[PDB]
Amino acid sequence: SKYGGECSKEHNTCTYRKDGKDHIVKCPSADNKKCKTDRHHCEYDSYDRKVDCQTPV
Numbered sequence: 001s002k003y004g005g006e007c008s009k010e011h012n013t014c015t016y017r018k019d020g021k022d023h024i025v026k027c028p029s030a031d032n033k034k035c036k037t038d039r040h041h042c043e044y045d046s047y048d049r050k051v052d053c054q055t056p057v
């Protein structure tokens with residue numbers, strides 16, 4: 001369902017692993033989902049069709 005990776009603060013992207021490959025998707029521009037901290041964990045949720053670059057911990 002959920003595919004994990006790390007985000008780029010400079011580019012506001014999430015690079016996630018799926019099917020043995022890395023995929024780079026823009027993070028949201030929303031304040032509490034964008035990449036605020038370089039290399040923060042991020043997730044692509046394939047069920048909900050959404051990205052978050054401020055995943056909880």
Ligand SMILES: [Cl-]
Binds near residue numbers: 020021022
């Ligand atoms: Cl790859």
Ligand SMILES: [Cl-]
Binds near residue numbers: 029
């Ligand atoms: Cl915007």
Ligand SMILES: [Cl-]
Binds near residue numbers: 031
């Ligand atoms: Cl806020």
